[PDB]
Amino acid sequence: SQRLDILKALTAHLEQITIANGYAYDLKGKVYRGRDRFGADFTSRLPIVSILEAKATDYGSFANEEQTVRMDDWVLLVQGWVKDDPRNPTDPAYELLAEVEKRLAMLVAKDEQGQPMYPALYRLGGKIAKLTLAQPVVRPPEDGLSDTAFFFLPVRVGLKVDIRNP
């Protein structure tokens, strides 16, 4: 599938946030997906990033009548957990969020002269057209209490979908 290949590519792209690659956090094997619930088997191994999809069934912008080709606005709910500092309850999440944003930007980040900085990453290899990172949210859980820091980062992936080869 198209959507699944894109998701796997984002995952393997974030699974390269590693200390051997020049990042302060090690996410190899820990960019999880399709889990709505993360327990002690996971939380005992932070930091962890999880990419779920938004529960909204939007309608794309169609290129043709017969409504076969469209530009999707596929929203992905990137979120992550890292054990906090009890006296600075949410500072760690800003740093992981920064690493994740910096990694994701590699896909669209042009240099100052309009050329791609990382051409092989750029748009995951033509799989995606756009990557609109939302203003991220770092908060404690609204009810409940935790020494685990939460960051919430919606990502709108733009991609051409032809339902003849979806």
Binding site: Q16, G22, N64, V69, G114, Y118, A120, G126, G158, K160
Partner: protein, 375 residues
């Protein structure tokens, strides 16, 4: 074969011609162009049969077709303004002066006076020092001859406290609105020294700018097509909002012209996909300071450089050379990247003030920079 449904992106370049000539000077990248539209305004000459019909058309030929367009740039830099304001960039340097003198007649309280406004410095000088001022009655004429203004007949020194405050970098005097000494009909003579500064301006003129405009296609969806206008006249379009909540944009309109009877107005290049460059050979470099402040002459601070290939992977073993603007010493000056593609070096500086650090690879990739302050 396939239908090419396209989402538009790309880079715009303008090859400004030398005045009165079609001689190219070089493709200047505008920067981000949120909007780039081509509009063709056509007028046909129609002939109607007068012999048989009512108003039967029998001939119709294109009399004029105005190929052209408009585009907006979001990057505000000297060149694009000089293009918008129909002018030229004037990279100049203001002469060092000592005991420069000027007279303001009349002066009104609650007003700003700019030092050094003259044909050599039409927006006034910057970096004034050693300012002192004397007032005189406005009825009489005073002259700033040789020697100090204090020797001027009938002039008296003005103490700044409660009479004026001086912006030395801008060279702007503020005559206080409740000043007692400068109340009434008076004039002031001023004496100031002028630091030498390289001092960039944009001069607005009334001369149209011709050039070759090229659009490269970065379409994330659909095939790429590169548009080339061998000659266009670019003029400002619309309004340039210097103040607002949105980002500044300059809208340009261009009119395509025939460079010569041989060359057409526009060439669209159909771009077939080329073989990608080897990413493992490409290089990307980013540098960031640990902190932007240090005590001058102390232990300084570390800034970290990360080197990556076209895959985002960190590069072990690339040679890096650091350098700084002035007075800063960098040890090690040249470093080799670790397994994590990172290198670090320490900058420290004897004299207080700001500095910036940059790192450069083999092949000269980048001049990335961070800012450092020593105090």
């Amino acid at each position: 074969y396939q239908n090419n449904y396209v989402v538009g992106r790309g880079t715009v370049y303008f090859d400004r011609f030398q005045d009165g000539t079609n001689r190219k000077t070089g493709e200047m990248y505008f920067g981000n162009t949120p909007e780039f539209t081509i509009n063709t305004d056509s007028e046909t000459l129609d002939h109607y049969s007068s012999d048989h019909g009512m108003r039967v058309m029998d001939a119709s030929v294109l009399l004029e077709a105005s190929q052209g367009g408009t585009f907006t740039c979001d990057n505000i830099n000297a060149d694009n303004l000089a293009l918008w304001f129909l002018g030229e960039v004037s990279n100049t340097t203001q002469t060092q002066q000592t005991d420069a003198k000027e007279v303001f007649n009349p002066i009104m309280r609650g007003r700003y006076y700019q030092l050094g406004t003259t044909d050599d410095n039409p927006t006034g000088v910057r970096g004034v020092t050693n300012f002192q001022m004397v007032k005189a009655d406005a009825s009489i004429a005073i002259s700033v001859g040789s020697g100090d203004i204090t020797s001027i007949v009938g002039a008296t020194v003005v103490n700044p406290a409660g009479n004026y405050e001086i912006d030395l970098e801008a060279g702007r005097i503020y005559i206080e609105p409740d000043s007692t000494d400068l109340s009434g009909n008076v004039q002031i003579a001023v004496q100031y020294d002028v630091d030498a500064q390289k001092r960039t301006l944009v001069i607005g003129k009334s001369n149209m700018v011709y050039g070759a405009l090229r659009m490269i296609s970065d379409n994330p969806v659909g095939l790429n097509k590169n548009y080339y206008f061998p000659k266009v006249s670019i003029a400002p379009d619309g309004d340039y909002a210097l103040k607002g909540d949105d980002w500044q944009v300059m809208s340009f309109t261009f009119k395509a012209m025939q460079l010569n009877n041989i060359t057409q107005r526009v060439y669209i290049d159909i771009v077939e996909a080329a073989a990608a460059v080897d990413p493992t050979a490409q290089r990307t470099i980013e540098i960031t300071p640990a902190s932007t402040t240090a005590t001058t002459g102390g232990a300084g601070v570390v800034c970290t450089v990360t080197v990556r290939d076209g895959t985002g992977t960190a590069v072990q073993g690339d040679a890096v050379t650091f350098t700084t603007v002035a007075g800063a010493t960098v040890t090690p000056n040249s470093a080799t990247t670790g397994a994590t593609g990172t290198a670090t070096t320490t900058v420290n500086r004897a004299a207080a003030g700001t500095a910036t650090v940059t790192a450069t690879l083999a092949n000269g990739k980048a001049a990335t920079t961070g800012t450092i302050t020593f105090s």
